[PDB]
Design a protein around this ligand. Structure first.
Ligand SMILES: O=C(O)CCCC[C@@H]1SC[C@@H]2NC(=O)N[C@@H]21
Ligand SMILES: O=C(O)CCCC[C@@H]1SC[C@@H]2NC(=O)N[C@@H]21
Ligand SMILES: O=C(O)CCCC[C@@H]1SC[C@@H]2NC(=O)N[C@@H]21
Ligand SMILES: O=C(O)CCCC[C@@H]1SC[C@@H]2NC(=O)N[C@@H]21
Lengths: 117, 121, 123, 127
């Protein structure tokens, strides 16, 4: 149910394949911030979830370097896939930029993204 | 390689074994001493393979889904942070732990915290 | 629509937030949750920017509830941090942290995080 | 209210946190930051659990600063959420959210997250 092409409330394009082992692999493209064109992603998901109506746990990471640009930063998304006639992936995320140790207290942004097919 | 590649330990007694590839990949295993977890779990992630040379740390992140051959907690953690080199190198992080829940219980699905890793001991 | 932070507000979880914004920056009022280890109303206090920018920016604010009243005590506290938007509708967008008291061995799992959006028109 | 949470507290970033805990559950006082767009003292208010568990658990609490005083305005607010742990090495252990006001287009980057630990013993340094 997870494999396919997804979009969020910020105009992003999330392309991902879920392997039978628990792997997540694919590409991320952001419409905002210090970013252009596509970026590599990798993560993990629960391949035998509970059967009681609970969602399926997952996560993935992007490091914001590619052939066109390097922002010296990385985002991780943590959340759950909820199946159904209108499938969704609901997340919260942490964006850390590299800093001097004197600026380390302001290194990390927090937010939330919702994805649909 | 040297630097991030190695065996790391946090303040909760975890053992984090990782390899950093020249292509920006992180690969390895994670063992937790706390929570609904037993033995080792697979991890994967990414890092900046060309950091700034102005004294800044190196940005990185990784994910564990808590299922292996011993048990399954129906959950996953992501760690987001930076690597700082030198005589007392560290990896400094914040994390999000999401558990699978019904819709009505989604407001209490996610724990947040902070872990510091060192290569000593 | 009715402008101003002072008023009666509802979130996407069934909660009610009743607040007054004072001229010096203070927030005072009550909070009622429809989920968790809670019943009836609880005291809150907080702060807001009483002279915000006017370049399209929202108004920054925050408040705290400790989950003890005359009916129940959950031994926990939540803080909400966010901004009053000030666009075409009355809306406040927030992120929150809920910490429960724990022993030291359980402190790693002490804190939940999430996001609530509040509107004067019940959603 | 005269001891415990009440007192002068210091964190790992050089801040000074001066607070009084009332019998009624209230927190009142001043906060001074040594980093960021901030100068001199700011007003704070918050709440704590005035009847905590007796099994050895910490005391739950939270407070807010809006970063406006007579000297400057950063158009932002921070909330700290955490617990008080008493003893010879008493601490207040916290996680925090700092929201800046932004346009609707930039709302995705409005909020910083971190963690502060406070002690009643003033750090040594430096002159
Ligand atoms: O600015 C950077 O350092 C890199 C681009 C960051 C984009 C962020 S990741 C979280 C959020 N969701 C998106 O689709 N874009 C932003
Ligand atoms: O209980 C679970 O659902 C799985 C085990 C969670 C262990 C967490 S991950 C964050 C923190 N750091 C650790 O080393 N262990 C805990
Ligand atoms: O169970 C508790 O410890 C006390 C009640 C907590 C309810 C939380 S506060 C964050 C979220 N928003 C709501 O309106 N309710 C929940
Ligand atoms: O830059 C601003 O907008 C206001 C100053 C923010 C300072 C922060 S609050 C969290 C952290 N702890 C401190 O003692 N200082 C910083």
């Amino acid at each position: 149910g997870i494999t396919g092409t997804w979009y969020n409330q910020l105009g992003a394009t999330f392309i991902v394949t879920a392997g039978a082992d628990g792997a997540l692999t694919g590409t991320y493209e952001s419409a905002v911030g210090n970013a252009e064109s596509r970026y590599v992603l990798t993560g993990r998901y629960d391949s035998a979830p509970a059967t009681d109506g609970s969602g399926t746990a997952l996560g993935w990471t992007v490091a914001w370097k590619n052939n066109y640009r390097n922002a010296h930063s990385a985002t991780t998304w943590s959340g759950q896939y909820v199946g159904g006639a209108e499938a969704r992936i609901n997340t919260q995320w942490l964006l850390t930029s590299g800093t001097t140790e004197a600026n380390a207290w302001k290194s990390t942004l927090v937010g939330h993204d919702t994805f649909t097919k």
